[PDB]
């Protein structure tokens, strides 16, 4: 590939899984480098940003969190990362960032 997408590997993973795997055994533990883990996060995000039928409350995602500080009594954090995806029919996706990459 030259341009990477989640549509791309979601299709690849599923076609392989439909042809070759059963629904329960379609978990895929990808091995990659940090710079692909961020590419993954970006694309998973770009995909979720189109989920307008759902409102992602922070009480469940906790992208923003309450932290102790001396600067304020309600001191807040911010930050999240997408490390998985669940395509239909049991297709899962999990990462293992190995420095060898």
């Amino acid at each position: 590939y030259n341009t990477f997408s989640l549509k791309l590997l979601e299709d690849a993973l599923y076609e392989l899984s439909a042809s070759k795997l059963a629904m329960d055994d379609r978990l895929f533990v990808i091995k990659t480098g940090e710079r692909g883990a961020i590419q993954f996060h970006k694309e998973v995000l770009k995909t979720v940003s189109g989920w307008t039928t759902f409102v992602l409350d922070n009480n469940s995602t906790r992208v923003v969190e309450k932290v102790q500080s001396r600067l304020h009594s309600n001191a807040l954090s911010a930050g999240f990362q997408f490390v998985e995806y669940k395509a239909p029919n049991g297709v899962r996706v999990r990462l293992d960032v190995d420095p060898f990459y």
Partner: protein, 333 residues
């Protein structure tokens, strides 16, 4: 190439034609022998190890005798012509990723369940042209299908310039958009490629494919950009590799079935078919029926293969011989 037999099949290479049992000097010389009272037919062939004759054919118990040309056995390679749908959009979309999918049907294993998918991805850009998109798509497929690391050849991919309209521009994994200097590219051809071959171990097979597309958002709706179409083939795999396996098979009826089992302790069989040639084939189906109760038929086949010089001279001469000696009529091809 194990095949099905109607209780037997036998093959004789007609390298030459001699007109007398005396003139059988070298291997591959063959003569049709039938008495004046045309009741029997057989062939005296010269083997690597001496003269030899074929089973006698009762001209009354012959079922069908037909000659098949070389082109009849030449597998035309299936080639598609994938373009983008002028309905969705006659041009690429500004910021869409076009992911073309080639699902391969009969991969390593025999079954249709042995599937294999190869992709070509192209993210379009504002100002991008159709020709430029075909360029990039073909190049992506090259890197994925015409690469050197692939275990087996899968497909050939080309490009066509509207100016040419028939010439196909090869696009290999070494090619680059600097080498593809044109602006009137109409389509992407994806052709079927010949798989490997081994005498008696790997029969002449192919792996077929259909091009599938993924869906792009064109206004606000997921839609398919491409239309895959089958156009007339222009390449053909020649007959040489089929006849060779046919001989590697049909000579175990006239001889050694332990082709190589017992490695030091074996009996090697010299063959007369060069897989780098093109043979025309001739098949005769016939049977033997017994007497007063043994009426059950024993259908049998005797096949003769001769090289084609382009106009079917060897076989047509062989046909004239068998027809003038047997009274048959085998429809020279």
């Amino acid at each position: 190439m194990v095949i099905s037999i109607n209780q037997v099949r036998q093959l004789y290479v007609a390298k030459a034609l001699k007109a007398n049992t005396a003139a059988l000097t070298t291997a591959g010389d063959i003569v049709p022998k039938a008495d004046t009272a045309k009741t029997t037919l057989y062939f005296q062939s010269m083997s690597p190890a001496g003269i030899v004759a074929s089973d006698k054919i009762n001209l009354k118990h012959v079922l069908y005798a037909k000659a098949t040309p070389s082109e009849a056995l030449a597998h035309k390679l299936v080639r598609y012509s994938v373009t983008l749908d002028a309905d969705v959009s006659a041009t690429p979309v500004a910021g869409q990723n076009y992911i073309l999918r080639l699902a391969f049907r009969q991969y390593i294993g025999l079954s249709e369940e042995d599937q294999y998918f190869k992709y070509g991805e192209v993210i379009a850009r504002s100002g991008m042209t159709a020709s430029d998109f075909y360029k990039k798509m073909a190049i992506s497929l090259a890197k994925n299908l015409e690469n050197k690391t692939e275990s087996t050849p899968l497909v050939n991919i080309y490009l066509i310039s509207a100016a040419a309209a028939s010439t196909d521009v090869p696009v290999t994994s070494a090619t680059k958009e600097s080498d593809l200097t044109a602006t009137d590219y109409n389509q992407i051809i994806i052709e079927e490629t010949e798989q490997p071959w081994v005498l008696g171990m790997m029969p002449q097979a192919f792996i077929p494919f259909t091009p599938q597309f993924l869906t792009i958002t064109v206004d606000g709706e997921d839609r398919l950009w491409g239309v895959a179409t089958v156009v007339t083939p222009t390449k053909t795999v020649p007959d040489g590799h089929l006849i060779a396996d046919l001989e590697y098979f049909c000579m175990g009826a006239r001889g050694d079935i332990y082709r190589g089992m017992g490695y030091p302790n074996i009996i090697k069989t010299t063959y007369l078919v060069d897989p780098g040639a093109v043979y025309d084939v001739l098949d005769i189906h016939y049977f033997y029926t017994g007497s007063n109760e043994s009426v059950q038929k024993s259908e049998k086949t005797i096949t003769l293969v001769a090289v084609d010089d382009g106009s079917h001279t060897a076989m047509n001469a062989l046909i004239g011989a068998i027809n003038t000696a047997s009274g048959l009529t085998i429809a020279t091809l």
